[PDB]
Design a protein around this ligand. Structure first.
Ligand SMILES: CC(C)(COP(=O)(O)OP(=O)(O)OC[C@H]1O[C@@H](n2cnc3c(N)ncnc32)[C@H](O)[C@@H]1OP(=O)(O)O)[C@@H](O)C(=O)NCCC(=O)NCCSC(=S)C[C@@](C)(O)CC(=O)O
Lengths: 373, 376
């Protein structure tokens, strides 16, 4: 694949769609899903959520120029706001000159919380759980034999205590679960429910909440980009001066939450539309993102911007990125499936890596514009 | 208006649309926007964002039972995830028995930031700006005649310093701008750019960033709800015990960020789908919400839950809520306009007040389910 899409910006929607179909070797019938309204039929929509009266469209777009670990990728995006897609495509074009985006990710590990109340010895009860951790892990894994055969499963447990709250002592167990190609919510919740009776027997306490955490800080995806000063030169400003301006803008985000909120919103402009296009839960991605940004005790920037030993601008994005290829609405929505086909992703972590590349690109675009006006 | 919508959950989509069309007196043309797929014309879609190749549908639903300061309201929602609309609807049903949701909001005030670097005396420059604030405020208000004539504009300035960063001393001025019925980005960005030269002249620094803040903590919207124990009784648990379980779930969120993230995500399950239904920017609402949740230096719960002196469960939500009745897709998408019609909102702050009511109801529904689920 060549993702450069020359003159895409100026083609009609129909022409653009035909080119995409040609590049990818889409069938006529796949192209029909975008060439005509109504790919989400009403019997599917009506079964997805409650009280349905119709469907609501947003535009479906494709960003150009992306390249991830040396492979060109086409990126579908669904959103209402202008300039997002153009900026992403432009920053991807710049990145390609220097190797594109380089990405990595952790295993798809999600937390399942099990909250325990009713005991006067939470700190002791924590150790009772840990002593019996293999038993707990085995009980969790008995509940999803398929996931274990797919290469996932409950890997570990961690236990945290809150001995002094206004509502009395609490203990919180986390199952740590590899959820393979799912976002993970229903997969881990089921394990949390399975182990609850055993945790009650061990601790002597009462289990209350059994629920994933959206702070998915064991499910991290990472992206890098590099930009040279020559690329950032304008009529008004040297590239070197733009790079210094971007570093100043970054330091401003790092110290001031009023700026960090906006800086990180720019990142989510790039990410959330890919999450929507793939039928994934964008509230989950947002909650993970912004809670992670404040993990230090200060709400700061998700990205970093620095100058390397050659004077080049180097950016990173590392963040939680819980997404699926299966589960929820990813399989339900025919255009979610088409998006995954467009992307060519074969694992959920591959999708997560593309997401962070797009977020990094969108922040780059915002940094560049704001440093050059 | 009566928003109870009896039997709604079991009616066909077409019958549901008929029933709300009767209640509202929707025109033929309004109803027909949902007779067939494709209500967003491709020429409008193509003008909205770049590189458009088609459209992407999500389900469009209406939550029932909502009442805001005594008035029934119907709430359109666009989202992919189950249980949200039902939970919001059921908690709204319970709320009605005790007066519905009570709401308030601040004026639609947004921050514009102007970042100034390279000043050798930033703390002194800040006073030079504050002395000249009327001048700055008048410059800000020079160009947007329409906003001024509608009762908005720049109201004030504040100035903050960060004298020691790794990139040297920074001054940051904020324009405080009433943006009336807009979210406000273009309004405040434009003002930030306009005032920049003058600030530079006063301070002697280089202006760098000129840009809104999404941490819209002067644009707050507030909701309250009340639920009695009799309303919460289940087969297994008294309503009193359910209240205690909900308070336990709240305290857990207040102390543990791993729970708070999830808890707040449930609020946003309620809010974001209304933002989407009205053509508004949900990334801006998300950023304001979650940044606000950590203003203290601890990432906590946006909602509060207590028991009052009568033993009733009382909940609050106060948060930033920047939304528009105008701008972008809110104007150009025919269903964003239909949603506004369904809602009956006449100002952006009224839309914000409904948003927080729905977020509050969603969080209550989520907690209630988790607090009452038996052990397996
Ligand atoms: C890219 C923009 C929108 C237009 O740039 P321009 O200099 O006109 O680009 P140019 O015309 O040179 O085209 C260069 C490349 O840019 C792409 N491109 C430009 N315009 C379009 C378009 N209309 N459609 C598609 N592609 C476009 C395209 O890839 C093209 O390559 P090609 O010539 O090979 O096709 C430029 O205004 C810009 O970079 N904006 C970045 C900031 C921006 O508004 N971002 C949008 C979201 S807003 C955001 S993230 C919120 C913030 C800013 O508050 C976040 C924060 O505060 O941090």
């Amino acid at each position: 694949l060549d993702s450069r899409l020359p003159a895409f910006r100026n083609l009609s929607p129909a022409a653009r769609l035909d080119h995409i179909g040609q590049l990818l070797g889409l069938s006529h019938d796949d192209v029909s899903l975008l060439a005509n309204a109504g790919a989400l039929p009403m019997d599917i929509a009506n079964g997805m959520i409650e009280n349905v009266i119709g469907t609501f469209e947003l535009p479906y777009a494709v960003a150009s120029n992306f390249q991830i670990n040396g492979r060109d990728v086409l990126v579908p995006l669904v959103v209402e706001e202008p300039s997002i897609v153009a900026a992403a495509s432009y920053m991807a074009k710049l990145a390609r000159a220097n190797g594109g985006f380089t990405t990595s990710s952790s295993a798809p590990l999600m937390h399942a919380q099990v909250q325990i109340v009713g005991i006067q010895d939470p700190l002791n009860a924590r150790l009772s759980l840990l002593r019996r951790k293999d038993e707990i892990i085995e009980l969790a894994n008995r509940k999803d034999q398929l996931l274990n055969s797919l290469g996932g499963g409950c890997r570990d447990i961690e236990v945290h205590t809150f001995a002094d709250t206004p509502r009395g002592p609490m203990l919180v167990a986390h199952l740590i679960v590899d959820v393979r190609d799912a976002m993970g919510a229903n997969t881990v919740n089921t394990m949390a429910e399975a182990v609850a009776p055993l945790m009650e027997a061990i601790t002597g306490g009462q289990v209350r909440l059994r629920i994933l955490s959206n702070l998915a800080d064991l499910r991290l995806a990472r992206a890098q980009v590099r930009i040279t000063p020559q690329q950032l030169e304008t009529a008004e400003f040297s590239g070197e001066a733009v790079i210094e301006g971007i570093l100043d803008a970054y330091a401003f985000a790092a110290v001031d939450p009023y700026r960090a909120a906006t800086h990180n919103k720019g990142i989510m402009n790039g990410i959330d539309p890919l999450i929507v296009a793939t039928g994934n839960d964008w509230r989950a991605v947002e909650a993970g993102a912004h809670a992670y940004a404040c993990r230090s005790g200060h709400y700061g920037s998700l990205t970093t911007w620095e100058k390397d030993n050659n004077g080049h601008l180097v950016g990173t994005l590392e963040m939680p990125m819980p997404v699926g290829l299966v589960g929820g609405a990813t399989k339900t929505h025919p255009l979610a499936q088409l998006s995954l086909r467009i992307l060519g992703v074969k694992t959920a972590q591959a999708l997560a890596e593309i997401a962070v590349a797009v977020g990094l690109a969108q922040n780059l675009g915002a940094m560049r514009a704001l440093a050059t006006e």
